[PDB]
Design a protein around this ligand. Sequence first.
Ligand code: 9VO
Length: 145
Amino acid sequence: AMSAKDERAREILRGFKLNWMNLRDAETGKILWQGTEDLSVPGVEHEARVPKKILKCKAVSRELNFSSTEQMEKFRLEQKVYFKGQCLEEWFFEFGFVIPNSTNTWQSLIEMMPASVLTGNVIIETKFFDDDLLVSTSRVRLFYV
Ligand SMILES: c1ccc(CNc2ccccn2)cc1
């Protein structure tokens, strides 16, 4: 007993997949982190170990490679950054239209505390949308190594 929008969300998600993601120091271009696991799955608790060095980056370039079986009118993300239950930062990134059964690459440019304190204390709540239709919600805990 599920809505029209509920069914469209169900379809998109099932037909969606995160292939890989990299993180480069915008300044140099040196890849600081490449992820293989799909961190877009809701319900699961993901974790990530990222090099401490990154916290001394003024800006970082984040590339996502994903595959969607379903067509999407405007694919965009909302991300809140939580420290010990307190939201510190919110961000919005748009990819736009997605071709059905396409594999797309998405590069976003992103413009401070001690690593000892942040490590394991930071959660990145990620909402996936088609235009203004919430398809999935993901939560990733970050560690600085
Ligand atoms: C989906 C897409 C992108 C992110 C971004 N989170 C991360 C993950 C690892 C390191 C830094 N940030 C989370 C979920």
